[PDB]
RNA sequence: GCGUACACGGUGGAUGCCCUGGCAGUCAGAGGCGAUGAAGGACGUGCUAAUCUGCGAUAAGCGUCGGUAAGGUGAUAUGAACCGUUAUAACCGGCGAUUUCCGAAUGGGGAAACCCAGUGUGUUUCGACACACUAUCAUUAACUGAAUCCAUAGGUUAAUGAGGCGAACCGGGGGAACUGAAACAUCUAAGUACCCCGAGGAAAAGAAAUCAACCGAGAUUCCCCCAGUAGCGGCGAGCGAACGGGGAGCAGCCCAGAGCCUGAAUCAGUGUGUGUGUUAGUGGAAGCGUCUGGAAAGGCGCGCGAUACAGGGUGACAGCCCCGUACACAAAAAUGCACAUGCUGUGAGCUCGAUGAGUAGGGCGGGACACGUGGUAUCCUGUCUGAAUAUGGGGGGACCAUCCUCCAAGGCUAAAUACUCCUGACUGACCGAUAGUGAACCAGUACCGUGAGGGAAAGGCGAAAAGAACCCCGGCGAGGGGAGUGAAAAAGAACCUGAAACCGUGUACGUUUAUAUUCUGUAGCAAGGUUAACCGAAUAGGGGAGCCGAAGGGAAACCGAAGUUGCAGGGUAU
């Protein structure tokens, strides 16, 4: 599908199977059950790819995924992140990116409603916990190459 | 005096059984191991 | 008005004290104590003590006219077992 | 207190400690037996002083 | 170190003594504090013929937690927090809220 | 005389709140202590009637150096009495002194906390007090030393090991009954419990005279598959491999004798300084008003901090009550971990040589070898005989040929690995006093058995004892009533919330986890999937020695198939 970066009026194309695949309730239920059990059960890469693609497509169809060119704070202060989130009127969002930023990670550390984690450490529980997810084009392509 | 001769601490210690029984008794932790 | 006098953990059989009290049930306090003065039962002393305590409390706190005081609610309950103990209760009022 | 007696020669330390342990101990025990010495910190201070003086004379010399 | 010590003026924030000021007399080892004229009790002391019995009911002061009383400063008249700083050769407590000097 | 229902009562604890409690796991050190007296007890030490803890007549402690230092003098659990309050109150830590008796207990005796001693030194007194020594076995060294000159046996002295206990692991030597074939023979139980020795915290072993044989893997040490395949058993129950194939680690050794040039890297011990920990600690963010409510931490309004909304408690649910946390710092002296650094002994590399000789093998007599020589075996004896040595041996299907190994009778090698008696920290789709530990409590206590051994029940006042001052009755007791505190006393020390069973009164009326088999659904992809063990700031992603399907079928002449892996469900086999 095609998504809007909402910061530069640039349209980005993504694989249909990722953001445009049908939502398989059984797969998501199985994945969340396995995650809860592991929090020993067999885990497969294909199952994880299917679940992440399904949840991402569902969120896109629900307008729960919004992407930005870059999300960071000029200084390692939580107030900067808080005011930046307030500007967009975002309170319960999941910040996902590529290489971890020391300033952004420090700012988001105390925020209970906001969690920061690496692209490779993405889990469905984090995606479903927060209402919306803020990612970046680099993170989007990283996820796309991870899922192949 | 028969009690001292029979259950005396030294008399018990004179034998290996006395040492092992008193050791396990202490392990249990009784206030009086023999008397 | 009402007056209360009770004893706890009395070292006596509950049934015996109940039977003794039944003799004075529904009777004037003055008449009850006068009759109990010569009673030879062991519980006679206990009932005398409780009634005198009741009248003393009435005269110290309640109003006068203690002679017309009447026996209203006298009972005994089984107590803790260590010869079962008993709890004696007397509620008396002129009315 | 702690260091005032440290500099003194061993002879006077021995004299004072022996005199204390021979006289003050008897006085305080008899007072306690008879009910005197209402304040008990005298026992504490005298016992500590005798212990401190006796701690010397072994490692110092 | 203790933020509250002798010769310190404090106000009880809650516990039937709101808005009343006083001076701390003693602090218990369990964290309780004693301030004259904030909490008067009616201890029913048992009379004794010796030991110079005060007589009748003694209207003394009970012990209250330090956490339930805040420190007072005369610079602004409102209770404020306190931290600790290092002076030229000693460490002393300094209030918060513009850092009033004790 | 009782019953039909209600209210008050007393032995009474079903129910519910958690706790100064236990239990299961994870990450690290330690993975032993001591004759310089191990572990544990007995008795004492407080202004003390008693307990925990500390200590030992110097007794809830002392000298020194650091941190903190204004409350403390340990608490249970109060009272009396103390010091100082800005560095000699008190608290924590390191370094030192003392440390009664029994206890291996070590001078002797002996009944555990008891008795009796001897030798030498100091005693400013020599009545008497303090200190050191006074046991046994074994070894090394020194001095003496009969038979017997020396040397030995014996004696004296200096030094070293052991006097015991400790949960588990390793090897070796023995080791049972219960045991299933409805008992039982070959066997399983089981080489389990148990007894002994050695000493290591990890141990032993640790680098081929290794296996197939004509191709091949190349140290020891642990792990999933192969694999419950072969094989073993009245082929039944049941037991049970690797050559070989992948992961952790992979380092090999040396001298085995001669020299050359040599004190050339390394090792163990011993100073200096650098960095991080152990060993006391420092700093460290931010809020009010009304309402409600005993009290706010309940919620309403608007604020601040957040590297810190992890957590503790504070009159009910706290970021801004604080203690704390994130984070930044800190050692006078002692201490581990790696460095450059001076020194004492080992001490590099090169060449030339042997390859650990009464040794391999062999004879007459056993051990366990399921089998007493029978279809028959390995280390060897009591003793004798007896190989060339690297040009040779073990040997390999014995063989010719060909091939691996050793270079044959020295041992060293931390690495990857089993476990926690105890120590430090964290967690609990674990329990809540009839549970959890036997014991949440003065519990391995009371108590029982003269010993082994067994073994309980017993908790919740009140947030704050602020404990019902006082007055009265009562016997100057016990008990109760007014008054008062207390939110409540339908919270009162016999004190958490509190239903009945039982007994009385008045009221209206009458008298088994787990290993397989099969079927159900659901989901991925597809002739594919799952990857095992492992790597991996970590259920991400890699990693298929390992499993089955499989453009194949068929008779490799010939023609030309869509299965697996997870989840939840059930029945069956013990």
Residue numbers in the entry:
A (entry chain E): 1 to 39, 93 to 201
B (entry chain 2): 10 to 44
C (entry chain S): 1 to 82, 98 to 110
D (entry chain Y): 1 to 61
E (entry chain U): 1 to 102
Relevant lines from the article:
The E. coli 50S large ribosomal subunit is composed of 33 proteins (L-proteins), one 23S and one 5S rRNA. The 23S rRNA consists of six architectural domains that, stabilized by the L-proteins, define the shape of the 50S subunit with its three protuberances. Here, we present a biochemical and cryo-EM based analysis of the earliest period of 50S assembly, utilizing an in vitro reconstitution system with purified rRNA and L-protein components. Taken together, early 50S assembly occurs in a domain-wise fashion, while late 50S assembly proceeds incrementally.
In order to distinguish states very similar in composition, additional structural elements were added to their names (e.g., d1_L4/L23, densities for domain I plus uL4 and uL23 etc.). To exemplify in more detail how certain L-proteins contribute to 50S assembly, we compared states d1, d1_L4 and d1_L4/L23. Defined regions of domains II and III show density in states d1_L4 and d1_L4/L23, respectively, before subsequent concerted appearance of their remaining densities. Cryo-EM density for the globular domain of uL4 appears early after formation of domain I, while most of the loop forms with domain II, and the apical tip even later with domain V. Thus, uL4 and uL23 appear to contribute to the formation of local seeds to promote further assembly of domains II and III, respectively. After formation of domain I, assembly continues uL4 dependent with d1_L4 and branches either to route 1-2-6 or 1-3-6.
